CSV table of C-alpha atoms and ligand atoms in Angstrom, one decimal:
chain,number,residue,atom,x,y,z
D,1,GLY,CA,0.0,0.0,0.0
D,2,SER,CA,1.8,3.1,1.3
D,3,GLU,CA,-0.6,5.8,0.3
D,4,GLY,CA,1.1,9.2,-0.2
D,5,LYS,CA,4.3,7.7,1.2
D,6,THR,CA,7.0,8.1,-1.4
D,7,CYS,CA,7.5,11.8,-2.3
D,8,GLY,CA,4.7,13.2,-0.1
D,9,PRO,CA,3.5,16.8,-0.1
D,10,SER,CA,6.9,18.0,1.2
D,11,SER,CA,9.2,15.6,-0.7
D,12,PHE,CA,12.9,16.5,-0.3
D,13,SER,CA,15.5,15.4,-2.9
D,14,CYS,CA,18.9,14.0,-1.9
D,15,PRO,CA,21.9,15.9,-3.4
D,16,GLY,CA,24.1,14.2,-5.9
D,17,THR,CA,21.2,12.1,-6.9
D,18,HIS,CA,17.4,12.1,-7.7
D,19,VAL,CA,16.1,10.4,-4.5
D,20,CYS,CA,13.0,11.9,-2.8
D,21,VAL,CA,12.2,11.8,0.9
D,22,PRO,CA,8.9,13.0,2.5
D,23,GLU,CA,9.3,15.6,5.2
D,24,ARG,CA,8.1,12.9,7.6
D,25,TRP,CA,11.4,11.1,6.8
D,26,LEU,CA,13.4,14.3,6.8
D,27,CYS,CA,15.9,14.1,9.7
D,28,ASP,CA,14.1,11.1,11.2
D,29,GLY,CA,17.2,9.0,11.8
D,30,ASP,CA,17.2,6.9,8.7
D,31,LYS,CA,19.8,8.3,6.4
D,32,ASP,CA,17.8,7.9,3.2
D,33,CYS,CA,20.2,10.2,1.3
D,34,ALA,CA,23.6,8.8,0.1
D,35,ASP,CA,25.2,11.4,2.4
D,36,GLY,CA,22.5,11.7,5.0
D,37,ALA,CA,21.5,15.0,3.5
D,38,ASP,CA,17.9,14.7,4.7
D,39,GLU,CA,19.4,14.2,8.2
D,40,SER,CA,21.6,17.3,7.8
D,41,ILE,CA,21.3,21.1,7.1
D,42,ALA,CA,21.5,20.2,3.4
D,43,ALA,CA,17.7,19.4,3.7
D,44,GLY,CA,17.0,22.4,5.8
D,45,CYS,CA,17.0,20.9,9.3
D,46,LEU,CA,18.4,24.0,11.1
D,47,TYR,CA,15.9,24.2,13.9
D,48,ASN,CA,17.2,22.3,16.9
D,49,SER,CA,18.1,24.1,20.1
D,50,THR,CA,19.1,21.6,22.7
R,5,LIG,CA1,16.2,10.8,6.7
């Protein structure tokens, strides 16, 4: 099934490749991007604070 899973409303693309990743997966712990971009500032995960 997986409805609206792959490349959801806010699908992010991993640099150096064409791999999408739903915002839900963005910085979730599972390095989907070859260089864990989604789990880094490369994806836009600046907000942290403690
Ligand atoms: Ca991720």
